[PDB]
């Protein structure tokens, strides 16, 4: 039932991302010209341009937003082997702290949920995930890398757990994009035992054999279990019922090949009921659930 439209915006170079803030009034798009720019929807529904500035030497792939409670910051990664932050001063943005501790290309950057503070997770092609901290919301010019996680493989995408119930310990999902002839799990999950005060490997999905492009976590909204979508040759949705690391009851719920190609990106709604997936077939297919608790398509857009 989804109908399309066209957005009145003009760019020069190809852009690699789009990301709303928390309300849906500020997007942040990174262009192939190393130039990121921020739009701002107005009261009349139009989109204007507010800022733009070139980034570091590499090529930017990801730009993410932050919760409005902490101010207005964005984290962006590029092949410059560095991760950046940006704060509004009013509007001239300023660099605050370039988290440069990686010997490879930091593929992904993501922000931790609000309920625990200002953390951001990055891992590079070397296969080591880093977690950073801002233990003074006052000044953003000071960060600390507490935990380093060995992955014994590469990174493609990571995603946190939106769930904020006290029962659930913090969780993280690390992908891989290695097409080695051997077969190994390419998606793994880590937990955080407060007793050991460290991140421990919890569960891995052995059914994953091909390279993985993207991973996302469906928001909780008070549910009992968790919902996870993995980008592969086929879109797949897994649910992990809670039972050291907590044992997880894993069973598949969907497996979709209605693309005839390789899936690139996966996204979720605010509620966590509609999935939007994009692939090399040049179409965007949105999947929702039906009355029989069955996962089926709802619109194919191009």
């Amino acid at each position: 039932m989804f109908v399309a439209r066209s957005i009145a915006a003009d760019h020069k170079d190809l852009i690699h991302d789009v990301s709303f803030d928390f309300h849906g009034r500020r997007m942040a798009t990174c262009s192939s010209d190393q130039s990121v720019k921020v739009w701002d929807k107005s009261e009349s529904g139009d989109w204007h341009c507010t800022a733009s500035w070139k980034t570091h030497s590499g090529s930017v792939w990801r730009v993410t937003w932050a919760h409005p409670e902490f101010g207005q910051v964005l984290a962006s990664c590029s092949f410059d082997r560095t991760a950046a932050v940006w704060e509004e001063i009013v509007s001239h943005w300023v660099k605050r702290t370039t988290l440069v501790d990686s010997r490879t290309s930091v593929t992904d950057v993501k922000f931790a949920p609000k309920h625990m503070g200002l953390m951001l997770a990055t891992c590079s092609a070397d296969g080591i995930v880093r977690i950073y901290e801002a233990p003074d919301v006052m000044n953003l010019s000071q960060w600390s890398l507490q935990h380093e996680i060995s992955c014994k493989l590469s990174c493609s995408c990571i995603s946190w757990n939106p769930s904020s119930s006290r029962a659930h310990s913090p969780m993280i999902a690390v992908g891989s994009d290695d097409s080695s002839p051997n077969a190994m799990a390419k998606v793994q999950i880590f937990e955080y035992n407060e007793n050991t005060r460290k991140y421990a490997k919890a569960e891995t999905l052995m059914t994953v054999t091909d390279p993985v492009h993207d991973i996302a976590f469906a928001p909780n909204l008070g549910r009992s279990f968790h919902i996870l979508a993995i980008a592969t040759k086929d879109v797949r949705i897994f649910t992990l019922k809670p039972v050291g690391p907590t044992k997880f009851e894993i069973h598949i719920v969907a497996q979709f090949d209605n693309h005839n190609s390789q899936v690139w990106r996966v996204s979720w709604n605010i509620t966590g009921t509609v999935l939007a997936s994009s692939g090399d077939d040049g179409c965007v297919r949105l999947w929702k659930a039906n009355y029989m608790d069955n996962w089926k398509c709802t619109g194919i857009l191009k």
Binding site: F22, H23, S165, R166, A167, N220, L221, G222, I270, T271
Partner: protein, 73 residues
């Protein structure tokens, strides 16, 4: 109409908190305020927001309950 055992559950509070956050996403501030009135009058366990109170410079204590005169000293 809930007796003060169901409302204490860790599950029955999560749904209210998550609905309130969803209302925040709507930017439906006044609807949330009305719902807060409703929840507060029907659930004694909920403690309202923690905010600032001002304090005197000589007594050192709060002024919240001569009008111009402080009630402390």
């Amino acid at each position: 109409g809930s007796p003060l055992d169901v409302l204490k559950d860790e599950r029955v509070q999560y749904w209210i908190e998550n609905y309130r956050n969803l209302l925040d996403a709507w930017r439906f501030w006044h609807k949330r305020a009305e719902f807060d009135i409703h929840r507060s009058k029907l659930d004694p366990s909920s403690k309202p927001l923690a905010q600032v109170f001002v304090s005197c410079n000589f007594c050192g204590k709060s002024i919240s309950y001569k009008v111009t005169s402080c009630p402390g000293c």
